[PDB]
Amino acid sequence: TTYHLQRALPGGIILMELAFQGCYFCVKQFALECSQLSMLFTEECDKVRDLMHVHSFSYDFHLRLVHQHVLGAHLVLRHGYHLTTFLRHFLAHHPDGPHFGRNHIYQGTLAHQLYNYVADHASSYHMKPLRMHNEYALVSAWHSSGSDFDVSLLVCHCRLQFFVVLTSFPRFPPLAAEVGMARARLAQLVR
Amino acid sequence: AVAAGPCPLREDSFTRFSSQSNVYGLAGGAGELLAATLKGKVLGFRYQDLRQKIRPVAKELQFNYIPVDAEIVSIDTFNKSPPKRGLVVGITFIKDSGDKGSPFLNIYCDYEPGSEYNLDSIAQSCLNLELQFTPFQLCHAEVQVGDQLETVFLLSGNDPAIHLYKENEGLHQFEEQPVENLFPELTNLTSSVLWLDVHNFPGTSRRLSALGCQSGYVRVAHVDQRSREVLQMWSVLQDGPISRVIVFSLSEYSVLVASMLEPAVVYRDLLNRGLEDQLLLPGSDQFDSVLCSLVTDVDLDGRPEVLVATYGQELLCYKYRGPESGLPEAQHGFHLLWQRSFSSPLLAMAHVDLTGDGLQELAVVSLKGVHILQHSLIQASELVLTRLRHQVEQRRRRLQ
Amino acid sequence: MRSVSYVQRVALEFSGSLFPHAICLGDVDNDTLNELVVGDTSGKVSVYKNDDSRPWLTCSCQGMLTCVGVGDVCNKGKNLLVAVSAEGWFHLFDLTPEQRPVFKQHIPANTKVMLISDIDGDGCRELVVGYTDRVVRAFRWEELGQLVSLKKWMLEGQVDSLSVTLGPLGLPELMVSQPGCAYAILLCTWRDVVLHQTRIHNKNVSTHLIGNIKQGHGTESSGSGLFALCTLDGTLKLMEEMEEADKLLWSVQVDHQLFALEKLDVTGNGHEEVVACAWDGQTYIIDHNRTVVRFQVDENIRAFCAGLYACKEGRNSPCLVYVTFNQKIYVYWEVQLERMESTNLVKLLETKPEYHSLLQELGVDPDDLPVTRALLHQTLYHPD
């Protein structure tokens, strides 16, 4: 499903092609210059170049999809998908974090029979029984604000690992506010 | 059909043209060079010395009474006779009167003393003459009148005629005069003379005139000057327009004829054999149409060779095997010496010393511009030294 | 200065689109003769040999190609053809006696430029790849074979050209172009980025750079020290590294959009000349003395290259390669020049002392220019 787009300008046209290459999304920018006009066209081409932001876009897309499937009812992800492994892969691929995305992530760490018993009574602790051998991990989602975001907290026992994601097009103390109360809730409900 | 060696010519510079020229575009001047473009542009080429190098210079020249819509057809220039002094330029162009061409001829010559050679001053001193015919080629010739020499302009016309323009020392301007008075051999034409050559005889008072027309008719005339009579006259009829005719001595005189649909040829021993001894230059028609030609020593051997430039962008050079070499099997004749290629059709050439070293450069005007070609300095330097050391050794041996 | 008009050329057919870095010339079949390698976006790489108008042979990859190269990356002493696609693949081919690759491996994607050279000085060739987001990565081939990573550098300004240049003290150095007519030095420690600035109007001009320009005969692997930079607004600079600070040899300001930089020996005297080409086809050749030679190709240029090529009679000769928009590639293979400046004959004979002695014996004073002119005319055109 190849897609094309255009944008005309006094110096000429600028054409964009978006397509798929194996496991990759590919964007190509052409140019057609139909000296000062050429210099202006080059400057405009550079300006268009700096705003693809194809990296922050994928970051926000993935982080929004994870919060859209935190409920577990979204058809985006079907059965048999270990969300913990996918989250680990994503964190590994983007450890630095883009400077233009809207969403944020954070990870941390904080018996097995107790975990199974809690999973049996997950609705008592306002957790989720979602299961990925079908391993299950708890998760809690809530809307918050600060200066509007959706904060999701996913805990999987492996000693447990918890990921906090903050979901808000591309254009922290808000993250630290939820990070502070993340482990506090676990400590208070681990009784 | 195979070159007997490589070309000893290296290209020095190349000046680009906005628009093209024609076979009459190139002209002398001065060691300067004048090249005229069809759309009025006229350029002057020369070289400027700089301590230990030289730098080409290609400036533009502006001439007075040429309308911006005019189209230049032909150009020529010469120097005044030795008793006089000055440089004369002549340009024939065509105004576009609505839908009909209006031909015109302009003659530039500065009469103010001390400025007869200043090209810039000469550029605005022009006359203006109407034609009543479409001009073809402007050339000049030197004639003997009384005990003095004069130079006159010759112009071939759309009517099958040649018109002579001669200066009048009275009012200092050029006037048309009847042609039959001085050139009885240039009368009774029936086609448009594309090229005309007048070869004088040094030290005497005779000459050979040669001309070729569109129909292919070629006329040569051995003519006296004191009695103004035609000693002898020969003619022949080839096929296709005659793009060039030249008169030269192989060592006896001979004529080179360059047509367009046939190989170039040379008729040998005119004064003794007329037009029967015909030698054809081999393979000189496999490169489209021959547009220009030149006869000079491109070999530094003391004897002439023949250069042929084609529309197929080729620069063949032919050398004459003298019978003194004594190979009657492949008897005395012409064989291909070397051959060079270009990128655009070749239109004109000249053999003139531009750099100022005594070596002569070859200027080639093609469709895209002017190329200057020089002899390979390495070859030309190692060749001078051997001759000089031979000279000094011979002097020592013969002097003791 | 003087302009020239090269004539002899060969036209090759090529249907496809390509990046300005997907073309190279070198020996892929290991026969001491150069061949032409072009990588199309489609996923096919065409190799041209001799002067056929058709590709000598084609090798098909997967994905869209971004970089091509010929080199002894495997350190086996045999040259191989190595192609880097846009999505992070890495294909190898051996063509010394279609053409499926002999080795594949995934690497980081967004590749822009590529280089094969021994940078550290261990006698083994390393591979350097510069990416589209100011990230440079070094790799080495290790037999089990497989590429293994090395130090990785991060920069601010965009990366356009990689080079290896002999440093102040007999050691290779990795140099990268940085916008605004600047560059950076990467230290192969096994600050890691030493920026250098070279005046200047903008700070976003795309810059290109070439290094390791020869300076004599038989001193190719024996040294280096010169490098050159070109800016899109028409500025060329040739400068030498040395120890204290980089001495600038010369600078030239032209009015075209320079987008390529190569080196080529056209005069045949051992020294190499800087060759630059603009988008509209104007080409400049400058030696180490600011003597310029221009050459205009009346077309529009997609990609450019220069180097030794084997076109006729099985000989390697200097060649200029242009890619046109009319699905054609022009190879000019008669670009040799007898000299670079212009001199006539008198100044050339004046250098030699034999000519002075041999004329002093003749009793003619060589200071009378017309007399010597007459003598030379007599010697050249009337030798008897």
Query: Measured between alpha carbons, how far is B78 from B30 in angstroms, rounded to an integer?
Result: 8
Phi and psi at residue B268, to the nearest 5°: -105, 150
Q: Most distant CA pair in chain A: distance in Å? A: 75
| Residues in chain C within 8 Å Cβ distance of A43 | 204
Query: Any CB–CB contact under 8 A between A35 and chain C?
Result: yes
CB A46, CB A19: distance < 8 Å:
no
- Angle, alpha carbons B101-B105-B110 (nearest 5°): 150
Among residues B215, B212, B154, the alpha carbon closest in space to that of B179 is found at B154
Exposure of C118 in the CB half-sphere (CA atoms within 13 A): 10
Structure-block tokens of residue B144: 């003997």
- Whose CA is closest to B310, among B390, B379, B364? B364
Whether residues B342 and C359 touch (CB distance < 8 A) is answered with no
Query: Which two structure tokens, joined as six digits, stand for C2?
Result: 């003087």
Indicate yes or no: CB of C346 within 8 angstroms of CB of B357.
Answer: yes
Asked whether the beta carbons of residue C87 and residue A26 sit closer than 8 angstroms, the reply is yes
Q: What angle do CA C6, B33, B64 make, to 5 degrees?
A: 120
Angle subtended at Cα C241 by Cα C238 and Cα C246, rounded to the nearest 5 degrees: 80
C33, C100 contact by CB (below 8 A): no
Q: List the single residue in A with minimal CA-CA distance to C325.
A: A32
> Of C370, C348, C264, whose CA–CA distance to B374 is shortest?
C348
Residue C241: which of C169, C182, C189 has the closest Cα? Answer: C169
Helix axes C353-361, B377-399, angle to 10 degrees: 30
Which strand (E) or helix (H) includes residue C136? Answer: strand C135-142
> In what order do the strands lie in the sheet containing A160-167?
A104-109, A160-167, A149-157, A138-144
> Are the C-beta atoms of B310 and B318 separated by less than 8 Å?
no
Q: Give the strands of the sheet with B71-79, arranged side by side.
A: B71-79, B87-97, B100-108, B129-130
Tell me chain A's radius of gyration from C-alpha atoms.
22
Q: A8, exposed or middle or buried, with CB in 10 Å at 0-12, 13-18, 19+?
A: exposed
CA contacts within 13 A on the Cβ side of B282: 12
Give, in order, the Cα–Cα distances in Å from B348 to each of A32, B178, B327, B370, C22.
Answer: 40, 31, 35, 9, 43
Phi then psi for residue B383, to 5 deg, are -85, -30
How many alpha carbons fall within 13 Å on the CB side of residue A133?
1
Question: What is the CA A68 to chain-centroid distance, rounded?
Answer: 10
Query: Is residue C159 within 8 Å of residue C137, measured between CB atoms?
Result: no
Residue C47, Cβ neighbours under 10 Å: how many?
20
For B332, C104, C137, C143, the CA distances from C147, given in Å and listed in that order, are: 73, 10, 12, 9
Tokens 């928009």 correspond to C325
What's the CA dihedral at C322, C324, C329, C335 to 10 degrees? -30
**CA distances, B311 to each of A91, B1, B17, B23, B284 (Å):** 71, 18, 18, 11, 12
Report helix angle A54-68 to A83-93, nearest 10: 160
Q: Taking a C-beta distance cutoff of 8 angstroms, is the pair B371, B347 a contact? A: no
The SS3 assignment for C338 reads coil
- Judge whether A59 and A159 are in contact, CB under 8 Å: no
Q: Which residue of A has its CA nearest to C85?
A: A21
Nearest CA in chain B to C350: B52
Give residues preceding each break in chain A, C–N over 2.5 A: 34, 110, 132, 147, 158, 168, 171
Q: Which of C58, C117, C108 is nearest to C88 (CA)?
A: C108
Asked if B55 lies within 8 A of C354 by C-beta distance, the reply is: no
Distance between CA atoms of residues C61 and C82, nearest Å:
11
Q: Compute CA distances B6 → B3, B10, B343, C80, whole Å.
A: 7, 11, 19, 39
Measured from the Cβ of residue C291, the count of other Cβ atoms closer than 10 Å reads 16
Which tokens go with A54? Answer: 């194809």
C77 CB-near residues (< 8 Å, 6+ apart): none
Give counts: helices (H), strands (E), chain A. Answer: 5, 7
Gaps after which residues in chain C, C–N over 2.5 Å? 97, 144, 190, 198
* Sign of the alpha-carbon dihedral angle for C95, C98, C104, C108: positive
> Using an 8 Å Cβ cutoff, are B200 and B207 in contact?
yes
For residue C59, give both structure tokens: 């090798």
In sequence order, what are the beta bridge partners of B177?
A: B164
CA B305/CA B250 separation, integer angstroms: 9
Q: Measured between alpha carbons, how far is A120 from B317 in angstroms, rounded to an integer?
A: 104
- First CA to last CA across chain A, in angstroms? 53
* A95 Cβ contact partners less than 8 Å away, ≥ 6 residues apart: none
List chain C residues with CB under 8 Å of B388: 355, 358-359, 362, 379
Task: Give residue C313's region: left, alpha or beta (phi > 0; psi -120 to 50).
Answer: left
At residue A9, the 3 state secondary structure works out as strand
Q: Are A111 and A142 in contact (CB under 8 A)?
A: no
Would you say C14 and C29 are in contact if contact means Cβ atoms under 8 Å apart? no
Beta strands in C167-314 (DSSP E): 172-178, 182-186, 193-197, 207-211, 226-231, 235-240, 247-253, 258-264, 273-278, 282-286, 292-296, 301-310
Cβ of residue C11 closer than 8 Å to a chain B Cβ: no
Q: Kindly write down the DSSP assignment for every residue of A13-76, as one continuous string.
A: EEEEEEEEETTEEEEEE--B---HHHHHHHHHHHHHHHT--HHHHHHHHHHHHHHHSSSS--TT
Of C1, C374, C383, the CB nearest to B387: C383
Q: Which two tokens stand for residue C333?
A: 């293979």
Q: How far is CA B293 from CA B115, B318, C382, in A?
A: 34, 11, 23
Q: What is the 3 state secondary structure string of chain B?
A: CCCCCCCCEEEEEEEECCCCCCCCCEECCCCCEEEECCCCCEEEEEEEEECCEEEEEEEEECCCCCCCCCEEEEEEEEECCCCCCCEEEEEEEEEEECCEEEEEEEEECCCCCCCCCCHHHHCCCCCCEECCCCCCCEEEEEEEECCEEEEEEEEECCCCCEEEEEEECCCCEEEEECCCCCCHHHCCCCCCEEEEEEEECCCCCEEEEEEEECCCEEEEEEEECCCCCEEEEEEEECCCCEEEEEEECCCCCEEEEEECCCCCEEEECHHHHCCCCEEECCCCCCCCCEEEEEEECCCCCCCCEEEEEECCCEEEEEEEECHHHCCCCCCCEEEEEECCECCCCEEEEEEECCCCCCCCEEEEEECCEEEEEEECHHHHHHHHHHHHHHHHHHHHHHHC
| Angstrom distance (rounded) from CA A151 to CA A85 | 20
Read off φ and ψ for residue B322, nearest 5 degrees: -65, 140
Question: Would the CB atoms of A26 and C109 count as touching at under 8 Å?
Answer: no
How are strands ordered across the β-sheet holding C23-26?
C23-26, C35-39, C44-48, C57-60
The CB density around residue B363, as the number of other CB atoms within 10 Å, is 19
Residues in chain C: 384
Residue pair C92/C81 in contact (Cβ under 8 Å)? The answer is: yes
Interface contacts A/C by beta carbons within 8 Å: 19
For residues B351 and B315, give the distance between their C-alpha atoms in angstroms, rounded to a whole number: 14
Strands A149-157 and A24-29: unpaired
In whole angstroms, what is the distance from residue A119 CA to residue A129 CA? Answer: 6
- Give the H/E segment covering residue C33: none
CB B324 within 8 A of CB B301: no
* Paired tokens of C343: 């001199």
Q: What is the rounded CA–CA span in Å between residue B116 and residue B89?
A: 11
Are C233 and A39 within 8 A, CB to CB? yes
- Of C86, C69, C48, residue with least CA distance to C321: C48
Resolution in A: 2.9
Give the three-class secondary structure for C346. helix
Q: Which of A42, B125, B269 is nearest to C259 (CA)?
A: A42
Measured distance CA(B299)–CA(B360) in Å, rounded: 11
CA dist C340 and C285 (Å) reads: 9
Find out whether B96 and B69 touch, Cβ atoms under 8 Å.
Answer: yes
Give residues after which chain B gaps, C-N over 2.5 angstroms. Answer: 30, 251
**Bridge-partner residues for C369, per DSSP?**
none
Whether chain C lies against chain A with 3 or more Cβ pairs closer than 8 A is yes
The pair phi, psi for residue A12, each rounded to 5°, is 155, -170
For residue B21, with 0-12 CB atoms within 10 Å meaning exposed, 13-18 middle and 19 or more buried, which class applies? Answer: buried
Q: Which of C5, C333, C356, C360 to mutate to test the interface with B (most CBs of B within 10 A)?
A: C5
User: Between chains, do C347 and B53 touch, taking CB under 8 Å as contact?
Assistant: yes
Report CB contact under 8 Å: C87, A38: no
CB under 8 Å to B32, separation ≥6 — which residues? Answer: B44, B45, B46, B119
| Own/partner long-range contacts of A27-32 (Cβ < 8 Å, ≥24 apart) | A27/A52, A27/A54
B297 alpha carbon, distance to own chain's centre? 15
CA distance C115 to C138: 10
- Picking from A24, A39, A46, the nearest residue to C87 by CB comes out as A24
**What SS3 class is residue C236?**
strand
Taking the CA of residue A21 and the nearest CA in chain C, the distance in Å comes to 7
What's the token pair of residue B108? 């530039």
Residue A37: partners with Cβ closer than 8 Å, 6 or more residues away: A10, A11
Phi first, then psi, for residue C216 (nearest 5°) are -175, 180
Whether C132 has its CB under 8 Å from any CB of chain A: the answer is no
Q: The tokens 């965009």 sit on which residue?
A: C158
End-to-end Cα distance, chain C: 39
Which residues have C-beta within 8 Å of that of residue C198, sequence separation ≥ 6?
Answer: C181, C182, C183, C229, C237, C239, C246, C248
Method of determination is cryo-EM
What is the spatial distance between Cα B296 and Cα B9, in angstroms, rounded to a whole number? 15
